[PDB]
Symmetry: none
Subunit: 231 residues, 2 copies
């Protein structure tokens, strides 16, 4: 099986000592029930319009505080969970892309937690969570064309041996590792801080796995709890 062992640099652990994440590695199977994602996304959106989940405001506040700690302005560039929540509250919902994305976005919405999905095959070496020095190339998009950009010095980034794969921790994924329709080897990283109880992180992960098992029966899963707050 394709394993993934994310490395959390000591400097990031010292910056966010309560960080704990579920790292879920998935060997995909044929996608026979795509409507699962539609049901999950509707439920997630309905559940947030009433104001929940109970830890949501506090958790997204911690992520905004953590962004400021590494130099970002979350009012402009927030964690992925806050970006999804705002779209849900403002729009009549969150638009669909494809079933796997709708599903993990649904989990992010319902459980107010950043959830990143990536293609393991595109990684060069292991994923590493580091403090950027500002000279790491990030393959992204600008004006509908490819772009070669930099993180800011001090910014927390996911990277591999080649370069940055997610900027500002969980603000924006690069193009190189994006999850497309027929990826066979997927990595999901569910990223939390202590205002989200561990049992809620567990529930979010279980809800993602059960959705995957309903959507693509036969999927195989290996997950790990990682981070300085996970022991």
């Amino acid at each position: 099986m394709l394993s993934v062992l994310p490395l959390i640099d000591q400097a990031v652990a010292e910056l966010a000592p309560g960080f704990r994440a579920l790292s879920i590695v998935v060997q995909a199977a044929p996608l026979t029930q795509p409507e699962v994602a539609r049901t999950a996304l509707d439920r997630a959106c309905q559940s947030v319009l009433a104001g929940g989940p109970a830890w949501g405001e506090a958790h997204l506040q911690q992520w905004a505080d953590t962004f400021r700690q590494f130099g970002a302005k979350p009012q402009r560039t927030p964690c992925s969970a806050e970006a999804l929540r705002k779209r849900v509250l403002r729009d009549g919902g969150l638009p669909s892309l494809d079933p796997v994305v709708d599903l993990y976005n649904a989990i992010s919405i319902e459980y107010a937690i950043p959830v990143g999905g990536e293609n393991i095959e595109a990684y060069v070496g292991s994923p590493r969570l580091v403090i950027a020095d500002g000279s790491e190339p990030f393959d992204t998009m600008k004006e509908g064309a490819p772009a070669h950009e930099f993180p800011d010095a001090g910014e927390v980034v996911w990277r591999d041996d080649q370069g940055v794969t997610c900027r500002r921790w969980n603000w924006r994924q690069g193009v190189r590792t994006r999850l497309d329709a027929d990826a066979r080897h997927m990595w999901f990283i569910l990223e939390s801080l202590p205002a989200m109880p561990l049992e809620a992180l567990t529930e979010a992960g279980d809800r993602l796995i059960e959705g995957l098992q309903a959507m693509m029966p036969g999927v195989q899963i290996e997950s790990a709890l990682v981070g300085p707050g996970g022991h």
Copy 2:
């Protein structure tokens, strides 16, 4: 199974502040390649007859020291890893018992580390690692009949809501929670002290997981590192 997370009481963490363990929870799949376990056990025994692994002597010495700290005599009641190593060195190999047990025994031998295997479904509530007061019943065997015994006051034990599940930390598992042939929900606890480096613990866990995935394709696995010595 959806989230087994063992609890380590503060008093045990204070007794052994370098304790670090991999907690691996497995949803079994049909066991189609039992020869994997025999091959693993053959390899493990040959590696120890050759004198290895390099951390083994120091690691088992730490387990013996820790046993003495909680009042045990490891020369009479040793940790499970020492009991296996003694047998291998005396006899030149290890007999087969059951494929899953043979596999995790192989890991314990090759990586000189206590490895416990238990049926999660038999647990009443969550596993907890505690200091015994001496009045907790331990369902075990003596002279081939059921027995109700006590830990010593001060002894480190694993327990659940009902009683002790493993006496003297990793010396002897109870009958209630033993792993039988086709148990569906399995907990493996790989227990280490600082003379075994983290990278060796990680490799032990990876070799166990790789063995299970070869033995029972489709197995679902979740892992976590616990204890005061995990950071």
